[PDB]
Structure 1
Amino acid sequence: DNVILELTVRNHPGVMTHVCGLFARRAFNVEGILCLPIQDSDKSHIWLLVNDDQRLEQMISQIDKLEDVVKVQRNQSDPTMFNKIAVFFQ
């Protein structure tokens, strides 16, 4: 159903616009997002919750090509992490 993408990116302006822009240009909806800075660095962590799609693998390719994306992978996180976060903020 859904899948979680984990990105390590540079914490500088415009990075999230590039990443989400790849989905926007494909009418691909992003269901959940978490972005947290990494202490003592110039980078941030991004979690993207998206519907599992045949187009996903070619998109991971496009994300990795972005200069400000250091790494992009799948399903390393708690698959229900956004449900647990929502319990405390919704």
Structure 2
Amino acid sequence: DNVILELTVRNHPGVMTHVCGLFARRAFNVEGILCLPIQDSDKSHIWLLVNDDQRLEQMISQIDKLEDVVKVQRNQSDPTMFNKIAVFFQ
């Protein structure tokens, strides 16, 4: 099964590298990404599609403690959002 991670982050350089770096060093593959800026703010929203995994719980607290991560939520977006997007942009 897959699950969506939703992040509110600051829209500054380097922020996306720190987030995926946590997945990279654990060899945890990210299957889908969507990052959009939030209008009239210095923040962006990030949706990550990842396989559910016993390690994701340890990984959520380390994403939250990153300085430029405002908020992180899991399983609050139905995973098929990326199959919906995939219908328009292959």
Using structure 1 for the length normalisation, give the TM-score: 0.98
Q: Which runs of 4+ in 1 moved over 2 A?
A: none
Q: Match of 1:5?
A: 5
Give the Cα–Cα distance (whole angstroms) in 1 for the partners of residues 78 and 20 of structure 2. Answer: 21
Using structure 2 for the length normalisation, give the TM-score: 0.98
Where structure 2 has 5 or more consecutive residues not aligned to the other structure, the ranges are none
Give the Cα–Cα distance (whole angstroms) in 1 for the partners of residues 17 and 35 of structure 2. Answer: 13
Q: How many residues align?
A: 90
Give the deviation of 1:79 after TM superposition.
1.8
**59-68 or 72-81: which moved more?**
72-81
Give the deviation of 1:75 after TM superposition.
1.0
Where structure 1 has 5 or more consecutive residues not aligned to the other structure, the ranges are none
What are the superposed Cα offsets for residues 25-58 of structure 1, whole Å, 9 maximum, x if unpaired? 0000000000000000000000000000000011
Give the deviation of 1:78 after TM superposition.
2.3
What are the superposed Cα offsets for residues 1-42 of structure 1, whole Å, 9 maximum, x if unpaired? 111000000000000000000000000000000000000000
Q: Match of 1:71?
A: 71
Taking every aligned residue pair, what percent have the same amino acid on both sides? 100
Aligned to 2:88, the other structure's residue is in SS state helix
